[PDB]
Write a protein that binds this ligand. Structure first.
Ligand SMILES: *C[C@@](*)(O)[C@H](CCCCN)NS(=O)(=O)c1ccc(C)cc1
Ligand SMILES: *C[C@@](*)(O)[C@H](CCCCN)NS(=O)(=O)c1ccc(C)cc1
Ligand SMILES: [Cl-]
Lengths: 264, 264
């Protein structure tokens, strides 16, 4: 696929601290068309359920639509294309051969733009998946990392090395979103990156991409994005079909954050 | 309510050409909290069905939520507060006494951020409603007018006197949205304005507000917004529950555009 050249292929050295959670992230199609990003999340039972977090605006919100989604694992460029180069802006060499079809919708809610699916097919050990941890505490972090499929193309990584902020979407009054500021010449996110995770420094999901002003040409405060918060989605719309808590902590352990789980 | 001072109270002379479609627009609450804008739309049978167009991201997509929504008609400042003045930025004197409760969802679709509700209660003649026309043709216009409740506060009007453009949301590749550019010191839209109509110069709904960079301090290309298009929503997700056509032209007249219908 094709995305902005300033983005950073996950196989680049910039991915060296994220070789586990890289394997959580997937691209998917909707009604056959490459559409959005999501990622696999662990739950407090550490049971490998195929919980797959994405964005509500991607429209994976009915049983009918979820039934025919196709999830593509391990779609990334085989080599590190220099960020900012014509190569990085070119069609990559990723494979779309490792896939699975079908899901059900466990919860969805507009306010924090989240959808939690559960994929129908158990993880194929051969795909070498990872279920990422999460952190639902009400706080900002000193930096964060995005792993995403911009334009639903090969997987990329984008780092933030400044504090997050809490606000409503697009800077409005509110607390539903984490505002993440990209590096002046670093990776960003693009349409199709929606639903991709943002990870704390401890590699725990804090939210999933809603949208924002960033692009490779964006400067200043425009080089940033908003993530619907796990903190907010945890309680969501106050019902099991509109929140994360029933799914990610079904046994009521009281966990405020958990670590990931490998397929190994 | 309180909204940005650059906005223009509908009773101002700027509303002199829109005294009909002003009466289409309402503010509404969601689980009791003032939340978003929507508006009444005519259909090809001219029958006063309470079709009420709003934005999908406002989250009025389930029977439970739609059943408890409250719609507030004729909420506007009684006098024209000078745009840009401290008065315009102050709490207004609108009334929230003319209301009705409850709706059902007729159609919704994420890609053009639309929801078509049908309100449960037939129009009270005393509220003096108007059902606006619509135009589903695939084209730009030379200007456009927004009527909306920014911050879900008193009703405002914003005029665009330059051409619209067609794009995806936030300027992405696509054709799902109408991009409307506000006047350098004119009215804009704000969170809470979502779901409000944009009208052609002929006063026909062309779409409903999704979002965008505008605010009273925005300049240039940022002083603009994106509306999910009626053109796009007409066919929507390809089923009656995901598109406008079955509802706004149930009669199968083949109309490409219709005019409005007054309570009289
Ligand atoms: C849906 C997502 O892929 C995008 C991500 C944009 C990231 C830009 N830096 N979100 S969005 O805001 O463009 C969007 C929101 C709603 C709809 C219906 C489409 C696109
Ligand atoms: C929901 C709407 O009230 C706003 C309108 C913003 C207008 C700015 N000029 N849309 S939004 O983009 O701020 C938005 C989109 C999705 C969600 C969940 C919240 C807000
Ligand atoms: Cl949105």
């Amino acid at each position: 696929g094709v995305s902005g050249s300033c983005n950073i292929d996950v196989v680049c050295p910039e991915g060296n601290g994220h070789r586990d959670v890289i394997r959580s992230v997937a691209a998917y199609s909707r009604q056959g068309t490459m559409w959005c990003t999501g990622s696999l999340v662990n739950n407090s039972a550490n049971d490998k359920k195929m919980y797959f977090l994405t964005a509500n605006h991607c429209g994976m919100t009915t049983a009918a639509i979820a039934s025919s989604m196709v999830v593509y694992w391990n779609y990334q460029n085989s080599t590190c294309r220099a960020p900012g180069s014509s190569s990085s802006g070119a069609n990559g060499d990723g494979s779309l051969a490792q896939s699975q079809t079908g899901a059900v919708v466990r919860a969805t809610n507009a306010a924090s733009d989240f959808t939690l699916l559960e994929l129908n097919t158990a993880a194929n050990p051969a795909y070498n998946l990872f279920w990422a941890g999460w952190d639902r505490r009400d706080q900002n972090f000193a930096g964060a990392t995005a792993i995403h499929h911009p334009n639903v193309a090969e997987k990329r990584i984008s780092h933030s090395t400044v504090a997050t902020e809490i606000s409503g979407y697009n800077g409005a009054t509110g607390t539903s979103h984490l505002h993440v500021f990209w590096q002046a010449s670093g990776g960003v996110t693009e349409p199709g990156s929606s639903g991709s995770p943002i990870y704390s420094p401890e590699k725990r999901v804090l939210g999933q991409l809603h949208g924002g002003p960033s692009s490779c040409s964006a400067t200043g405060a425009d080089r940033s994005d908003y993530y619907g918060r796990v903190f907010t989605s945890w309680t969501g719309g106050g019902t099991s079909a509109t929140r994360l808590s029933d799914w990610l902590d079904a046994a009521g352990t009281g966990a405020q954050f958990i670590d990931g789980l490998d397929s190994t």
